[PDB]
Amino acid sequence: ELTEDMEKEISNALGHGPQDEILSSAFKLRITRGDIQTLKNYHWLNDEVINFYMNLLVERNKKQGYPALHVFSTFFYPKLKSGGYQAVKRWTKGVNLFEQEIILVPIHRKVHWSLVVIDLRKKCLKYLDSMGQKGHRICEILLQYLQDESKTKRNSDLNLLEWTHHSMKPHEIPQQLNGSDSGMFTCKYADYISRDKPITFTQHQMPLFRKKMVWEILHQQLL
Template sequence: MVQVINFYMCLVTERSKREGYPSVHAFSSFFYEKLTSGGYKAVGRWTRRVDLFQRDIILVPINLRLHWTLAVIDTRKKTIKYYDSLGQGGDKICETLLKYLQEESCEKRHVKLNVSEWTVHS
């Protein structure tokens, strides 16, 4: 299943390169697990060639053992939305991703991210 999820994320990213589509960056299905186990230092290099803040949408597939969910970061609207077909809340996941964005902004752009401008929908 991991290969299917990662392949689909690649397809969405490729399609976003066409005119008329929002620019998308999709993380692999291993990103969130690595982020939660090792913190920002474990995944900081994953975007060394990508400025996430120049993308319109960032997709983060999340594997919860037997269940897949998706977090969508919209940099234009400054929102993080968590989608779970079982209806479980993802507040902690959204907070983790917002913290990641703060660290990414400081590390790569040397700009402090104003968290109060961002909204989270779980």
């Protein structure tokens, strides 16, 4: 499924060369060779690669007719947890969250990547983690955020009684078996959940996924 020229192109992007060389530009982001290399085996993905891919999921969904998706920046959560609604209020200029269906919130833990899914169509939150960490409290903060967004942007409070939030069972969602693919799991969780697809991948696919993601980023086209 990966042409010999696709591989030759991926190999070229991951190979030797200056850090700063820009290899793909879109969404006001500039993915340099240094960013792309975090996609090498055993390497830790950075915010640039994740925000970029997340932006691709939104575009892909619009093009292939999947649910209206909205993705927050990897910087949103930390900013929220530290300055509350006021610090992130304007981060939604001219876009009504509630006109969306699936909302993705990437979550950066000091040295680990995580994902929160807000399904407006079912009014339920879900925390996804490849290393089984807990996130009940993260969803609470996010839900409170929605409430404040609703009252502040469309003068009407959410009926919290309708929303429900369940943390995913380590035996339901695939877990990572090593020490460096949490960023990858986060992106692939988001990918499958954006398409309402059962998360059926395993740690075994990660290497190919990594290879494919560099091609997908350079070509700004998913596979």
